[PDB]
Amino acid sequence: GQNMRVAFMPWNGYNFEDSILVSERVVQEDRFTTIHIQELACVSRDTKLGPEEITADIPNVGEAALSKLDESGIVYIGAEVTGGDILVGKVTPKGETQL
Amino acid sequence: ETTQTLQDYLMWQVELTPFTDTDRAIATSIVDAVDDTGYLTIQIEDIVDSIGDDEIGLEEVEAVLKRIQRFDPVGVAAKDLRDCLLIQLSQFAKETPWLEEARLIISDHLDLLANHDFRTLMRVTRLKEEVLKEAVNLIQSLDXXXXXXXXXXXXXXXXXXXXXXXXXXXXXXXXXXXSANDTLLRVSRCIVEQQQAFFEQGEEYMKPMVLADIAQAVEMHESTISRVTTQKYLHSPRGIXXXXXXXXXXXXXXXXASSTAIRALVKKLIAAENPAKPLSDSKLTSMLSEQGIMVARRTVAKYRESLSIPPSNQR
Amino acid sequence: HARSTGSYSLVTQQPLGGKAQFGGQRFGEMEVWALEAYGAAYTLQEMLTVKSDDVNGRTKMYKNIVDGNHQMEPGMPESFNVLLKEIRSLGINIELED
Amino acid sequence: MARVTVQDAVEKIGNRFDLVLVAARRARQMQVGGKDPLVPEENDKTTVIALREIEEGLINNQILDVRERQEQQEQ
Amino acid sequence: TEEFDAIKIALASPDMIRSWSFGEVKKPETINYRTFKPERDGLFCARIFGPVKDYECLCGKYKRLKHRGVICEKCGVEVTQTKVRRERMGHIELASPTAHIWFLKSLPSRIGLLLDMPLRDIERVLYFESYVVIEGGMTNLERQQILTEEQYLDALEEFGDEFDAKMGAEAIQALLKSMDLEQECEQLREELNETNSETKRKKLTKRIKLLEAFVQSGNKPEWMILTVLPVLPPDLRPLVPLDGGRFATSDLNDLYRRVINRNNRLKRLLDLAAPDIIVRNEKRMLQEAVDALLDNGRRGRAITGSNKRPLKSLADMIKGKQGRFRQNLLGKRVDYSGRSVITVGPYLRLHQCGLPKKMALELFKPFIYGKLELRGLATTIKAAKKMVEREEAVVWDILDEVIREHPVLLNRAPTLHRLGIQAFEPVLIEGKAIQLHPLVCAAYNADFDGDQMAVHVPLTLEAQLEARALMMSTNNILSPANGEPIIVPSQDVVLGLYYMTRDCVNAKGEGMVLTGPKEAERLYRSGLASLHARVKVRITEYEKDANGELVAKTSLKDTTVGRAILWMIVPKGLPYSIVNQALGKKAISKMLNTCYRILGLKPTVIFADQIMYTGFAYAARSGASVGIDDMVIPEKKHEIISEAEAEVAEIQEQFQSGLVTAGERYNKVIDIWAAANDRVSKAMMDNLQTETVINRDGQEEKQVSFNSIYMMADSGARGSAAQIRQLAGMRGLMAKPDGSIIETPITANFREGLNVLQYFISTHGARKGLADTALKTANSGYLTRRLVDVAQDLVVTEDDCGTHEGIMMTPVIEGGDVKEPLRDRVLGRVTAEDVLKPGTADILVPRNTLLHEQWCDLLEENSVDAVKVRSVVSCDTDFGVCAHCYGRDLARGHIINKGEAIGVIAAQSIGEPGTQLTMRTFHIGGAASRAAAESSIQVKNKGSIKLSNVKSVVNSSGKLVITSRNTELKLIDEFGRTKESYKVPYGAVLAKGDGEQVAGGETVANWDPHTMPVITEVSGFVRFTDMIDGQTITRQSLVVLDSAERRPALKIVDAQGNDVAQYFLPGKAIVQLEDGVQISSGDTLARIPQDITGGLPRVADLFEARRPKEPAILAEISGIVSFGKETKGKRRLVITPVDGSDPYEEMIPKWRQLNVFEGERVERGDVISDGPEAPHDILRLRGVHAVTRYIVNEVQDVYRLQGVKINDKHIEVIVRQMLRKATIVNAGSSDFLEGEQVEYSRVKIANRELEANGKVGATYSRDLLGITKASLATESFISAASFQETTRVLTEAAVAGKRDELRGLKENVIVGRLIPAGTGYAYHQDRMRRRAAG
DNA sequence: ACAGCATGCGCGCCCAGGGCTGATCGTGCAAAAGTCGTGCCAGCCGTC
DNA sequence: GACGGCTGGCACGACTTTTGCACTCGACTAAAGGGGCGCGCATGCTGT
């Protein structure tokens, strides 16, 4: 952890029961800012209709959503993904749609 | 993810737009004709005759259907597929580098001949350089238009069944996976291992297999042998297709392949052929007769032209 | 979390169990004892059925909120009739009297 | 005008249950429509306007009954 | 489609099933899988249940459904009700009437019993072979007999023609069809009068009540076997959760098509004239088929399936989960709540909460859609959404007007009482956390460690008013279980107001006059101190002394700057002397209390808010901190330690001499270190004086120190001197998980480091203390479920019923000092009859009134020791409480209104206290260990004493002892009210003679438990007795005899020259004298002695009415009890004598103590003691009043140990709920010797005295039990079992035909409706008058 | 003539033991259904 | 513009495969049917 200057006094009810007050300079100084790391994994399988392929085309998706995807459908290292965006797609076949 | 789809969500969208009486009735009469593609309203005369007269003319239902076509997944229902394209172009941007006009020229008419190739049509639309190619890029960037439902999160994996391994120039069964249960599985892992020994996938297709041979080997009933392989799918190192290597024929010839290599290699021989548009079934039957398969040319033409084959309509 | 309306489930037509997948938290019989301790009536009525286990009540109530009606359209939805049918399967009868 | 305590409006006819239902059916008229408030509006919702009409004594069960008889007689 | 008032369940008829729905299926053809189109006949398909989708059908006619009530071709036309799928079911037609499995018998099983014949016979003839003979006569055999294939062949051979026997139940339908119910019931009553057999009683009562149930129910018993069988809607069948569900794979579907198949086979074979064994095998296997339909069993294992499904089908699948469960009942999702962490802030007046803006936008999202579509900026709802996630600055401007006056609900995970949830007005705040108002840490009970909180949003319309009326916190300033003001200021407020009103001496400036006083302006201008001096100031003060007016005045008074500045906050006329003293938490709670009493609610809520503001403000500018120099080390403590061990080293030396054991040394050590703890504590209290002082010299204590520790501990804000004793001074003793205190305490404190042995031993206490919280919290939260389970059914009904008889209210106090006066007990409620002054003819109240502070002051300044008060129980009112006796309406005030729910606050109010007591009952004995020397019975305060329940015994000394079992002592306060009331030990030796009284001093009793009086009251030798072996082995001067294994009492010897009073048996006795030895009065003849309420597990025994170990017998009227009078050769102490008829006799098997030695003829109500009294004998003899004060006074005596207060109202309500299910002594209209309801008994007595007949119905005996059998005694079958089996409940309700009547809670909760409690209850009334209008 | 204790008998409860269902498992076969081959008929084209 | 040849589509027949009955066939579960043990109690011989 990190030690800081601590003052003992009730101030405007800001410290009530077990609560605590901190300054803005603590936020400005990056003090005890935390970093996290997660993982997402995609799986490719072989179904009864044959094997699965990966990206290189997608229906019903605009170009703005696929602009951040490199060829083969992998994201650029260092790109910023926010919310419901797409990382690495895939495809599963159907049949008898060509009549 | 256990969610409502199709006319449940679409009808739920219809209930939001206020419809006093008639707009709601004819609206519910429209929403039931939507298909998985979504742009098929079939015959409008059926929707008009289904009302059972009492006014409600065609002009009143036309604006209602046009209101159905404006829902969330852009183009909906309408007809001829040339309508929903106009709605896709109208609500897309409304400010474009001359894409709107040329979009109405291409979407209006002449699009039938412009899909295969441009050629002389490039002089018809007067466009030139990268304007026409960029417009075709826009047409390629449009869209089936709907099909936004589904929401198919999961795939139902085959999970294999029994397994095999190739040793020193030979493939043998192993039935790898996972006392009456151990022996019960040992029977299938046994007859399946001998069936994998007699049949090798080997090279190019598979050796013809007759249920009478596998039934004669262990003296097991062929009904029980092929009955289990029908539901279950044996998963080998390549492929998925267990009952396909069980049901066959005697090929009706001494010099030979079975229906598996007959139809398989028939479509393979028809794959590379017709330098332009030969579409000759008698020539393919002669090529099959040159290999000694004893083809009557009646079964080769009818059986070869089936299963997604373009024949004989390729002419 | 602070959900509002997410996707639902086919079984019992109830929202999903937990957050991120948008859970609908929990409402216990102890809080029922609290509202009953207040003598609360319409609030208990909406928390138990229309807002929780009622299917078409989300559509009618939702259309009442969008249009600004703010009316419950009182009555007994869903489980009462299903109970009439499940009991009616048995050889004993249920009626309606005043 | 915010109402901190409802007891002053309940003191008219004491129940503390009836104010919610009577003020509710009074809030149905101005809520849905086809009616006008008898008190000048502060731009606040009709929810408090109900309690303020109960506090002014202009609206009660008997008044809504007489107005109901007037609406039935005028129809 | 309309409100549900009530329904009785009746047995359906085949004509009723043909009435409800209609369908015909001759073939098991459902749907062709290559088509997916309606098909002819079949079930589970679209052929029945009307249209398949919306309203339409494929027939070729009747497609528009212009006609109804018939079938077309492949699609049922009849709807006649509504909906689409779930609509009218249809049915199938069986050829031979059959099936049910669990129809006649519910295991058990009333049918097959009512008819009169064993169940094995019917179960045997329905299956297998055996036939029932019918159309008998002309021979000795009867139709009640059963036959077998051999007896069938020999029967048709010998008996010949007119002999009919059938396999199916058609023979049972005819035999039951020929039964006459009225004449049979008359014969069962005529046989009921003659037969005295107890086993015959219950059977005849059951049969009679059954037959009657068929009489008034109107249901034919032959309807039990149904010909027409309806089928259920297919889609209502819940699909298996595993993998995907399929309607064709349904467990019952295979059974349905199986019954259809066996039905077609049955029709084909009956139309084919098949052999008898064949078609009869078809009938039996059809019976087994429907056996498989409804149940999985009772025929054996009938289960079928692909995976062999277990069968939780129709039997177990009704409303799912083996009963009525799914509706309500916990885990349903809330749909529009949220959760977040709470943060405190010095704003948000009492109704408001900080709501993060990110959380507010999603909850009010639909209102956002509505007002965006309303105010005119919008196109479509989806584009409105687009505006929602694009978050324009105008959207928040919309939301500001959205929230406004529409508050929100707050919920914790636990709710221990009503106030646990409250509503507040949201105020948008930047953050990820929710802000809550500081003033209440109590109702929520949780401080802020980062706990997570739930937020529920009701909408509706009237839910807004319901939120702003009975919920918002500003409406309830009081607790429903007490009436003492909640939301008492604390923490920084107490420190700020204590530092604010404080007085100072000799500072800069003084001796000046300020008006108003106007001094506050200076305080910010310095040149003055807020705590410096007292200065003449002119203050204006209002008052209410003039009725409806305010009398003012302005005076010159002395006060401190802070006090006069705080006087601005006083709202117009509170007295000035309340702020004229140093304000602690006490004076703060009294300030808000007197402010709420005098000025009401609205003044004291904003008053409390402003006291909060100035409290955190001046507490903010106070600037108090802690430090190492604040804690002082006593200089005499080093001596107190040195004095302690110097004594211990002496006592330990005694252990080297062998004169002192380990126990005496132990107690001496504990006493030495305890006295040392007291001495170092006083040295600490004297040390904390004169530390941080204002500038001054001399004086004495120099303006008592301003240091933080004395302000915190002395002011009572947060800490206290108890922990200061651990901070400064010694540590005292420690708690080892053994039960023996260590002899080497910790002599140090936190000023210096502790030794590894001190900190090592100090851990055992915490280790033994950490595991109690959750373990006791389990049961502490478990009792509330059962309390609500018993208490939920009571509701408010009437306004004032009126009555005369009631509960006599007299002040009672615990031992030693006075506990509660008559005020708190008589406060509120209702006073029955009149209460006279000490003078005659003068009445305090004309009839009755609700007692408030004024009338209580009239009772205080006058003398009344007995106040007649009404209550529950008494003033009994049909279907609930009269809502008069229950008044004083805690946490409010008014005459109590109608519609509230009673027992929900009574349950949560009793079960709300957490954990348990400090000690466990009397068994641990922590106050006194065994008996040191004597019990020390004496009085203290002035006034005369009056001996209650005493019996004089002649002694030679001037003092007279008492042999009575129970003895009380009365003291004089003013008119003779109880001051010190303590229980005198049984048979105490009085140092003061009887008939003599004295006020103060002069100890009147001496009691040691080595003795108990048996003495000769007259001089002369002991009565001659025989000494024989076998009676001398008894356990506590040779002993002679003992009445236990058989001190037997004999005639007293009145002379020393001749051998010639009555002695009670203690149960264990040893004779201390020899026969023929001279003894005198007042001298020892034989002297030697021989549940326990409190604790929560004992409270569960108080409500549950457990039976004690040693019961206490009670005495009735007449009888003769002296010295085992009328005692038989065996089983001593049995009372023979008639004594005025009433042959009262009690059987005591000679090993138990004797009732009394005197009194001769006694009466009902006399207390013979003999151990803890059982509530059954008290209710049977004393009455309902002694049971009421029994349970109430005991439970109160349990809760008074922790200082928590609970009013008697709730406990009395529970006692009233335990008085249900009482039995009648004599026959009524038609019934004998069974259980009944008190309400029905009272109504039938009202009909008894109503018109003509002298006696219809008779006296009854009240029964109690509780908490278990009373909860299962509910007369409503819908709420009867939420736990027990559903089948037997539906069978009892099916055959009996009892009405719902819907009075209760879980009734309208589980079935569902607007509940008949609260506002909704008024709704239920508001319709009835309309229904009464036409 | 009444009371005690010993004996005999009836019934409740726990333990042990057998027996249908369950776990499969088999599949023979006559026939019914699915599929492939095969011949026939109608539609399309070229040149005489 | 009429006709015969080519070819594709379709209905029918034959081949192959696989489903309801029909009689199996030997190594479990735990729930229910039977029996023994023990206990309660009623009857009666007897000693007081």
Residue numbers in the entry:
A (entry chain C): 797 to 895
B (entry chain M): 115 to 257, 259 to 293, 335 to 396, 398 to 413, 415 to 473
C (entry chain C): 1244 to 1341
D (entry chain E): 1 to 75
E (entry chain D): 14 to 1049, 1058 to 1067, 1075 to 1088, 1097 to 1126, 1133 to 1376
Text from the published report:
Gene transcription is a fundamental cellular process carried out by the multi-subunit RNA polymerase (RNAP), which is conserved from bacteria to humans (Cramer, 2002, Werner, 2008). The σ54, which controls stress related genes including those involved in nitrogen fixation, nutrient starvation, infection, and other cellular stresses, forms a class of its own (Buck et al., 2000, Merrick, 1993). σ54 recruits RNAP to its promoter sites via binding to the −12 and −24 consensus promoter sequences and forms a stable RPc that rarely spontaneously isomerizes to RPo. Instead, it requires ATPase activators bound remotely upstream of RPc to convert to RPo (Buck et al., 2000). In order to understand how transcription is initiated and how initial de novo synthesis is carried out, we prepared samples to capture the RPo and the RPitc state by binding σ54 R336A to a promoter (−35 to +28) with a pre-opened transcription bubble (mismatch between −10 and −1 by mutating the non-template [NT] strand) to form RPo and then adding UpG di-nucleotide as well as GTP, to allow de novo synthesis of a −1 UpGGG +3 RNA to form RPitc.
In this structure, DNA is caught at the RNAP cleft and likely represents an intermediate state en route to RPo (see discussion below), and we term it RPip (for partially loaded DNA). Interestingly, we observe an ∼30° bend/kink in DNA just downstream of −12/−11 toward the RNAP cleft, and the density is sufficient to accommodate both DNA strands, suggesting that the two strands are still in close proximity even though they are not base-paired between −10 and −1. The regions between −10 and −1 are in fact sandwiched between σ54-ELH and RNAP β-lobe on one side and β′ coiled coil within the clamp on the other side. In particular, the highly positive charged β′ coiled coil and loop (residues 305–325) within the clamp and the proline/glycine loop (372PGEP375) in the β-lobe are positioned to stabilize the DNA phosphor-backbone between −10 and −1, suggesting that they play an important role in stabilizing RPip and potentially guiding the DNA to enter the RNAP cleft. To accommodate the DNA path, σ54 ELH, which is single long α helix between residues 317–355 in RPc and RPi, appears to be shorter (no clear density for residues 317–330 in the helical conformation), suggesting that ELH undergoes conformational changes during DNA loading. The RNAP clamp is wide open in RPip while closed in RPo. In RPip, the β′ clamp opens widely, losing interactions with ELH.
